[PDB]
């Protein structure tokens, strides 16, 4: 009968072990005990991205954003989902928003967000080149 916190911590351990479906299931159990914690959903979204399930990740980003509209990770993971779906303008907007929010919040993710923006812009440009 583990607590929500214990379940999140177990999920995190499984994530370290690269056991992504197991980690995601654990975050689901945490959500069952307390569904009002945005971090459970962004953690699970990351698992779904690693599992190549952007649709499931996107839904979790939406749940996260309803609880925490300022979530840097929700915007970033949303952008990644949208890139997989070939929705480039949306993806770039979400990555730009993640960058802006991280700055406002003084968070340090190294060059991760700018790197993602460059990938997104490169992919958008490639899509244009692929069609002419």
């Amino acid at each position: 009968s583990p607590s929500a916190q214990e379940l999140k911590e177990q999920g995190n351990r499984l994530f370290v072990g690269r056991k992504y479906p197991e980690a995601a299931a654990c975050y689901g159990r945490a959500i069952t005990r307390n569904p009002l914690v945005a971090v459970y959903y962004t953690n699970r979204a990351l698992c779904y991205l690693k599992m190549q399930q952007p649709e499931q990740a996107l839904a979790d980003c939406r749940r996260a954003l309803e609880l925490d509209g300022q979530s840097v990770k929700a915007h970033f993971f949303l952008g990644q989902c949208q890139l997989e779906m070939e929705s480039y303008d949306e993806a770039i907007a979400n990555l730009q928003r993640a960058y802006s929010l991280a700055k406002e919040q003084r968070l340090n993710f190294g060059d991760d967000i700018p790197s993602a923006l460059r990938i997104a812009k490169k992919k958008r440009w490639n899509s244009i080149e692929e069609r002419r």
């Binding site: 999920g11 995190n12 994530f15 980690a23 971090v39 962004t42 953690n43 990351l46 840097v72 990770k73 970033f76 340090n108 993710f109 190294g110 991760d112 967000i113």
Partner: peptide, 7 residues
Amino acid sequence: PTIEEVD
């Protein structure tokens, strides 16, 4: 630190 980690 990377953004692709769990909290």
